[PDB]
Design an enzyme around this catalytic site. Sequence first.
Site, PDB file in Angstrom:
ATOM      1  N   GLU A   1      24.782  52.268  52.131  1.00 56.35           N
ATOM      2  CA  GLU A   1      24.824  53.537  52.107  1.00 56.35           C
ATOM      3  C   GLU A   1      23.639  53.949  53.299  1.00 56.35           C
ATOM      4  OE1 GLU A   1      23.962  53.490  48.143  1.00 56.35           O
ATOM      5  OE2 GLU A   1      21.984  54.525  48.348  1.00 56.35           O
TER       6      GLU A   1
ATOM      7  N   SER B   1      31.982  57.244  48.256  1.00 52.21           N
ATOM      8  CA  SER B   1      31.646  58.601  48.303  1.00 52.21           C
ATOM      9  C   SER B   1      32.734  59.133  47.562  1.00 52.21           C
ATOM     10  CB  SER B   1      31.969  59.160  49.563  1.00 52.21           C
ATOM     11  OG  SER B   1      30.636  58.843  50.389  1.00 52.21           O
TER      12      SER B   1
ATOM     13  N   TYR C   1      31.683  60.475  43.944  1.00 50.89           N
ATOM     14  CA  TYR C   1      30.988  61.820  43.682  1.00 50.89           C
ATOM     15  C   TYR C   1      31.698  63.006  43.555  1.00 50.89           C
ATOM     16  CZ  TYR C   1      27.371  58.077  43.573  1.00 50.89           C
ATOM     17  OH  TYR C   1      26.602  57.156  43.242  1.00 50.89           O
TER      18      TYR C   1
HETATM   19  C1  LIG Z   1      23.776  57.183  45.632  1.00 52.56           C
HETATM   20  C2  LIG Z   1      23.929  58.151  46.773  1.00 52.56           C
HETATM   21  C3  LIG Z   1      25.138  58.144  47.544  1.00 52.56           C
HETATM   22  C4  LIG Z   1      25.466  57.138  48.317  1.00 52.56           C
HETATM   23  C5  LIG Z   1      26.407  57.411  49.459  1.00 52.56           C
HETATM   24  C6  LIG Z   1      27.278  58.362  49.289  1.00 52.56           C
HETATM   25  C7  LIG Z   1      27.069  59.576  48.454  1.00 52.56           C
HETATM   26  C8  LIG Z   1      27.968  60.666  48.512  1.00 52.56           C
HETATM   27  N1  LIG Z   1      27.783  61.749  47.987  1.00 52.56           N
HETATM   28  O1  LIG Z   1      29.061  60.448  49.136  1.00 52.56           O
HETATM   29  C9  LIG Z   1      25.832  59.341  47.648  1.00 52.56           C
HETATM   30  C10 LIG Z   1      25.143  60.125  46.699  1.00 52.56           C
HETATM   31  O2  LIG Z   1      25.449  60.933  46.401  1.00 52.56           O
HETATM   32  N2  LIG Z   1      24.048  59.521  46.274  1.00 52.56           N
HETATM   33  C11 LIG Z   1      23.318  60.366  45.046  1.00 52.56           C
HETATM   34  C12 LIG Z   1      21.934  60.349  45.457  1.00 52.56           C
HETATM   35  C13 LIG Z   1      20.940  61.186  44.265  1.00 52.56           C
HETATM   36  N3  LIG Z   1      21.378  60.994  42.999  1.00 52.56           N
HETATM   37  C14 LIG Z   1      20.663  61.623  41.963  1.00 52.56           C
HETATM   38  C15 LIG Z   1      20.256  62.818  41.956  1.00 52.56           C
HETATM   39  C16 LIG Z   1      19.826  63.737  41.018  1.00 52.56           C
HETATM   40  C17 LIG Z   1      18.226  62.961  40.672  1.00 52.56           C
HETATM   41  C18 LIG Z   1      18.505  61.473  40.702  1.00 52.56           C
HETATM   42  C19 LIG Z   1      19.354  60.712  41.797  1.00 52.56           C
HETATM   43  C20 LIG Z   1      23.006  61.000  42.743  1.00 52.56           C
HETATM   44  C21 LIG Z   1      23.726  60.127  43.651  1.00 52.56           C
END
Ligand SMILES: C[C@H]1c2cccc(C(N)=O)c2C(=O)N1C1CCN(C2CCCCC2)CC1
EC number: 2.4.2.30
Length: 348
Positions: free
Chosen positions: A327, A243, A246
């Site tokens: 996740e 996490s 991000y």
């Molecule tokens: C992988 C997943 C995830 C898993 C576990 C935790 C977190 C967290 N934010 O903490 C996140 C997370 O944010 N994920 C996002 C999913 C959507 N995408 C993109 C958005 C734009 C369109 C294409 C996909 C970006 C990464």
Amino acid sequence: KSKLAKPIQDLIKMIFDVESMKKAMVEFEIDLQKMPLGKLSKRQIQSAYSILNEVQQAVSDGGSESQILDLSNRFYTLIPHDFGMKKPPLLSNLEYIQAKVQMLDNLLDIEVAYSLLRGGNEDGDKDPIDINYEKLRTDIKVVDKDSEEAKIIKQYVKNTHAATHNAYDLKVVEIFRIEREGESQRYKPFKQLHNRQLLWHGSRTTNFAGILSQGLRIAPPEAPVTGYMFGKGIYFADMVSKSANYCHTSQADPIGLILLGEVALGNMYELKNASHITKLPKGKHSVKGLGKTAPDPTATTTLDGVEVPLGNGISTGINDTCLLYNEYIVYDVAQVNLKYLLKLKFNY
Ligand SMILES: C[C@H]1c2cccc(C(N)=O)c2C(=O)N1C1CCN(C2CCCCC2)CC1
């Protein structure tokens, strides 16, 4: 002058920092000379989303190069970019179109923050910090650092840092307890589910005004459905660093914000490989993407009746899976109750 404790005041300043918003826009390659922070509109942003939808479709379906070019041009006329030296990258591959989708999600949150900051400052009586605090419609409290509550959170951070995420380690600067107005009320039915877990969600600091004020949200029917490994919902992690990635921190900018939410997962539709989830099977409440590593089921604890998977990361046994780490995904905003916000220091 403000009655709020020092750390909370600082948090409010961080969330509403105008310089941070511009830095975000610059990293997204927007031309701030032709599209200043002031000029961002909700209507324009939404239109951008449709152009991206359409061009993703054309790329997927083998539309003509001129359709792709025409859409690229329209995207860049609506949202002026500055590519400096380089030629403008065309919107002709899915990887780059998804990066643009991401950008628009961030702009909407920035638009939200900027508009709140600029609106409703009538009251000369109240300190502007307190005025801005109040616009987040969220009760925030500093969690005392020596309390058993803080001790459990700190261990979750210490033990669940992933192997492959070794660019940095993490320090908890501050822990806030947060309650978004109306959220308890909205989550209340889901107390009847089993398997309620305390999980991580990271996002950039510039999203936090929109997150606190509006809760975690699910992508509109209008964004391309393209890069969502498990469809459009709210994504969480049991490993802090997956996490924490991000948060989009750097050596240059090492402070981030991360959430702990109670997520009411129920019966998890478990999965191994990307799958565009549309509706959930009967009697399923959520999706888990299974990973090759996860906290040790042995150490898992409870906080207020919520499961806290704070064990050191061990191998999973499952290996016939794309993902390195778990996740978890829910599909109704009502299934999440945000519990804590942590201020983190990334030591690179
Ligand atoms: C992988 C997943 C995830 C898993 C576990 C935790 C977190 C967290 N934010 O903490 C996140 C997370 O944010 N994920 C996002 C999913 C959507 N995408 C993109 C958005 C734009 C369109 C294409 C996909 C970006 C990464």
